[PDB]
Amino acid sequence: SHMAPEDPNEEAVSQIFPDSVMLAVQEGIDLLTFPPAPGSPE
Amino acid sequence: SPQESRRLSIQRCIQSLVHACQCRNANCSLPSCQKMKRVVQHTKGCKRKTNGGCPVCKQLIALCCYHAKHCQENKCPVPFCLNIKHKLRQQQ
Ligand SMILES: [Zn+2]
Ligand SMILES: [Zn+2]
Ligand SMILES: [Zn+2]
Numbered sequence: 001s002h003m004a005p006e007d008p009n010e011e012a013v014s015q016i017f018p019d020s021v022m023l024a025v026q027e028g029i030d031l032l033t034f035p036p037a038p039g040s041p042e
Numbered sequence: 043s044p045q046e047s048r049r050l051s052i053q054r055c056i057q058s059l060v061h062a063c064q065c066r067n068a069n070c071s072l073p074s075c076q077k078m079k080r081v082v083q084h085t086k087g088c089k090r091k092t093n094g095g096c097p098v099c100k101q102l103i104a105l106c107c108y109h110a111k112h113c114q115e116n117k118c119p120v121p122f123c124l125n126i127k128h129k130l131r132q133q134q
Contacts, residue, residue, distance in 0.1 A: 003071050004070075004071040004073065007058075007072055007073050007074045008054075009054040009055065009057050009058055009074050010058075010073040010074045010077065011054075012050070012051040012052075012054030012055045012058075013054070013055050013058050013073075013074050013077045013078065015051060016051075016055055016101060017077055017080060017081050017101070018077065019073070019077055022080065022081075022084070022098060024081055024084075024097065024098040024101040024102070025097055025098050026097070027097075027101060028101075029052070029101050029104045029105070030048055031052070031104045031107065031108060033045045033049050033052070034049065034052075034108060034111070
């Protein structure tokens with residue numbers, strides 16, 4: 001209990017920017033993946 | 043639904059964003075907080091940032107945008123959140 005064991009969300013952080021390097025300088029998050037509007041003109 | 047894995051990765055990292063923006067100790071041993079601290083310390087001091095085209099700052103702000111899109115707290119601990127909330131109102 002003297003230190004933090006783990007965190008389930010760290011796998012989602014690591015693929016963007018891990019503890020080892022600033023991977024965010026070369027990575028590109030596809031934010032467009034979010035849910036669309038309930039309707040559009042189409 | 044191939045968007046599920048990416049959407050889940052975004053919202054999972056956003057819990058780490060909220061944590062690191064309210065965390066009472068800069069030395070926190072929580073793996074997610076430790077990882078977040080690097081990008082947080084970068085964007086607050088980057089002489090280029092999103093204004094000059096810096097990719098790091100953009101990756102952080104993309105998650106701040108996803109957060110702010112769904113958020114509504116007028117005093118949210120995330121610094122970028124409130125700015126994005128105000129910017130979204132200009133798009134209407
Ligand atoms: Zn922490
Ligand atoms: Zn930067
Ligand atoms: Zn917020």
